[PDB]
């Protein structure tokens, strides 16, 4: 492995359409090239598992993880978290549970015997969180009391609920709220059932076998971002420092999915 590579391979969690992600992250790519004296290569893998595996095998250098995919990767490889975005005045985000207006699902309890859409099995806000909400509020167990299907991206969850392939679904609040704006869905075809509580934001992480000097520079450059043109695409105010212990809440919730830490 190279401790100080000329090119940084930077992976983005595939929570949306790859073209949408590359677009959103272009100003950040430019900012990093300037302040790090590196070439940056943006990567979007096919799914969450393929991103976790690429990290374990040393094929990527930096990664923008979701909370659950981060703790899974941390259990398999030597990585360290270093920054998360502050959006709408907080370093947290929520899951939204939505229903198709034509399904007869008017509240959580009505999901009994119906079709629920989740994103990736390794997703926090499109799997772990909404599954937990349904259990705690309505005593409903996935696969036992309702049908569960995994459709991949958060974009796909919104699309499958809106077109009638699923009766209800769970996804990130922010991704849902911009789905009509992007023309993914007809907003009159869906309604909101409820929201989760607030959970820690997506962590940026890097392989720990980068040089100590390079690791310090990466941390400092991200936490120092105050350029409005980089922040605007993310609707963010800042990049905050983080620690591994900030994700213990997710480790404990993951017991429900059979994960041990």
Curated annotation (Swiss-Prot):
Pfam families: Phosphonate-bd. Transmembrane segments: none annotated. Keywords: Signal, Transport. One of its GO terms (cellular component) is ATP-binding cassette (ABC) transporter complex. The keyword Amino-acid biosynthesis does not apply. GO terms for biological process: transmembrane transport. The keyword Repeat does not apply. CDD domains: PBP2_PnhD_2. InterPro entries: PhnD. Belongs to the phosphate/phosphite/phosphonate binding protein family. Probably forms part of a binding-protein-dependent phosphite transporter. Required for oxidation of phosphite to phosphate. This is Probable phosphite transport system-binding protein PtxB. It comes from Stutzerimonas stutzeri (Pseudomonas stutzeri).
């Amino acid at each position: 492995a190279d401790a100080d590579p000329d090119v940084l391979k930077v992976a983005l969690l595939p929570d949306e359409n790859a073209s949408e992600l590359i677009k959103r992250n272009q100003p950040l790519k430019d900012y990093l090239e300037e302040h790090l004296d590196k070439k940056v290569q943006l990567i979007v893998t096919t799914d969450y598992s393929s991103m976790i595996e690429a990290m374990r095998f040393g094929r990527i250098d930096l990664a923008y993880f979701g909370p659950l995919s981060y703790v899974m990767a941390k259990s398999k490889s030597d990585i360290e978290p270093f920054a998360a975005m502050v959006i709408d005045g907080k370093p947290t985000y929520r899951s939204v549970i939505i229903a198709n207006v034509a399904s007869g699902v008017n509240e959580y309890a009505d999901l009994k015997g119906k079709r629920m859409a989740y994103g990736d099995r390794a997703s926090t806000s499109s799997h772990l969180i909404p599954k937990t909400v349904l259990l705690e509020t309505a005593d409903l167990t996935g696969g036992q009391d309702y049908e569960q299907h995994f459709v991949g991206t958060h974009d796909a969850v919104a699309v499958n609920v809106a077109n009638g392939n699923a009766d209800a679904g769970g996804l990130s609040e922010v991704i849902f709220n911009h789905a009509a704006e992007r023309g993914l869905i007809d907003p009159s075809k869906v309604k909101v059932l409820g929201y989760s509580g607030e959970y820690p934001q997506y962590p940026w992480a890097m392989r720990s076998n980068l040089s100590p000097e390079l690791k310090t520079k990466v941390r400092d450059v991200f936490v120092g971002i105050d350029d409005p043109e980089v922040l605007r695409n993310f609707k963010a105010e800042a990049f905050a420092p983080i620690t591994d212990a900030d994700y213990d809440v997710i480790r404990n919730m993951g017991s429900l999915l059979g994960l041990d830490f």
